Design a binder for this molecule. Structure first.
Ligand SMILES: [Cl-]
Ligand SMILES: [Cl-]
Ligand code: NA
Length: 129
């Protein structure tokens, strides 16, 4: 599923992401935009042989099991394939664990480089929430 901006905002709001650990909804939409272009089916391989999965590009090195990242953790306790579903629940539940782990949204390189310190409220402008 490729989400529309407001569609995704509403979905993330329903799943409890607005102001989760102090991050306004705009931050999450901005992150999803640059990580996945709002496509639940996005995958990208890393140089270390890990793979990033889904709308928030969660990394198999730490967070999910894809059966081919030897020595990796499965900290969200999910197959990485679950992160590619049209239903964002698994991605959102995993993201909450990541964002809680001490580094905040700095875990997402595209957030740090493209969202952090910008007007992120722009990303939810116009939406009925
Ligand atoms: Cl916002
Ligand atoms: Cl980047
Ligand atoms: Na959903």
């Amino acid at each position: 599923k490729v989400f529309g901006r407001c569609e995704l905002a509403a979905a993330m709001k329903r799943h409890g992401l607005d102001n989760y650990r102090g991050y306004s909804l705009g931050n999450w939409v901005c992150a999803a935009k640059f990580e996945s272009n709002f496509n639940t089916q996005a995958t990208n391989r890393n140089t270390d042989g890990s793979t990033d999965y889904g709308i928030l590009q969660i990394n198999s090195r730490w967070w999910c099991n894809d059966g081919r990242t030897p020595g990796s953790r499965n900290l969200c306790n999910i197959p990485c394939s679950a992160l590619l579903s049209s239903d964002i629940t698994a991605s959102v539940n995993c993201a909450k664990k990541i964002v809680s782990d001490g580094n905040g949204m700095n875990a997402w390189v595209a957030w740090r480089n493209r969202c952090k310190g910008t007007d992120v409220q722009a990303w939810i402008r116009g939406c009925r929430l």
